[PDB]
Amino acid sequence: GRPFVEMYSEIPEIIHMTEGRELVIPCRVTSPNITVTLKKFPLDTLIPDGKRIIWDSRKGFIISNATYKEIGLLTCEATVNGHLYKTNYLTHRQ
Amino acid sequence: GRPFVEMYSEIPEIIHMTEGRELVIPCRVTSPNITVTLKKFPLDTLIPDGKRIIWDSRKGFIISNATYKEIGLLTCEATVNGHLYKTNYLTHRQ
Ligand SMILES: [Zn+2]
C-alpha cells in the first residue's frame, strides 16, 4: 500500500532548513487515521506536542523553530495493515 | 581500506550544482593509482575524456559544464585490493 502521498524510501528527498525558522517535514499521508513516527538518524525520535512540533496529516510535521539538531537524515515511519513504511528526507541549510 | 578521502557510503553528501557551471563531484582518493568510475543512478556511467569531464585524483571529477542530466544520485566507485567501495552524492540546484 501507500500511506505517504510522496514516498522517498530508497533515495532521500532534500529539504532546505533555516535555523530559527519553520521546518516542514512534508510526509503528508493518505488518511488522517495513519499514525506517523518522526525519527532523526540514528538515535532520536521526535514527538509532536502540538506546539513546538505539530503533526498535520495533510502537510507532515511542522517544526516551529528549527535548530541545528534538525540537520541530518529525518525519517517518517508509518505502520499500516501490519507493514512498516518509511520515507526519508535530508535536511540542510539555506 | 579507504580509497576515498571522504567516504559517503550509507547517506549521500549533498552538493549544489548550477546549470552551465562547473560541477565537482568531490570523491578525491588516497592515491593517484586508484581507478574510479563515476555513475548516475540508475543506468548511466560517465566517462572522463580530459575535457568535458576531467578526473583529478586530488579533487574528484570535474564536469566543466553541468546540465540537468547531472541532477540526481551520483556515485564514485573504486575497486582496491579486490574490494568495491562506493561514495554517494546527491546533486541539486543553486
Ligand atoms: Zn541544497
Residue numbers in the entry:
A (entry chain X), B (entry chain X): 132 to 225
Copied sentences from the primary study:
Three receptor types have been highlighted: VEGFR3 (also called Flt-4) regulates lymphangiogenesis, VEGFR2 (KDR/Flk-1) is the primary proangiogenic receptor, whereas VEGFR1 (Flt-1) has been proposed as a regulator of VEGFR2. In this study, we showed the presence of a metal site at the dimer interface of X-ray structures of human VEGFR1 domain 2 (hVEGFR1d2) solved in the presence of different divalent metal ions. The three structures are similar and reveal a homodimer with interlocked hydrophobic surfaces buried at the interface and a divalent cation chelated by four histidine residues (two from each monomer). Importantly, the dimer interface involves residues that lie in the core of the hVEGFR1d2 surface that interacts with VEGF-A, VEGF-B or PlGF.
Contrary to the Co2+ and to the Cu2+ ions, the Zn2+ was not intentionally added in crystallization conditions, but was a posteriori identified by X-ray fluorescence. A zinc contamination arising from laboratory items cannot be excluded or from the putative ligand Laxaphycin B. This cyclic peptide does not possess the peculiarity of some Zn2+ chelating peptides as Cys residues, or thiazole and oxazoline rings. The Zn2+ ion adopted a regular tetrahedral coordination geometry and was coordinated through the Nε atoms of the imidazole groups of His147 and His223. The metal ion coordination site is octahedral for Co2+ and tetrahedral for Zn2+ and Cu2+. The mean estimation for ΔG dissociation was 12.7 kcal.mol-1, 58.1 kcal.mol-1 and 18.4 kcal.mol-1 for (hVEGFR1d2)2-Co2+, -Zn2+, and -Cu2+ respectively. To evaluate this hypothesis, a model of hVEGFR1d2d3 was built, oriented as in the VEGFR2d2d3 template and positioned as observed in the Zn2+ hVEGFR1d2 dimer structure, followed by a GROMOS molecular dynamics simulation performed in the presence of explicit water molecules and NaCl. The homodimeric model retains the d2 dimer interface and the bound Zn2+ ion after a 2 ns molecular dynamics simulation.
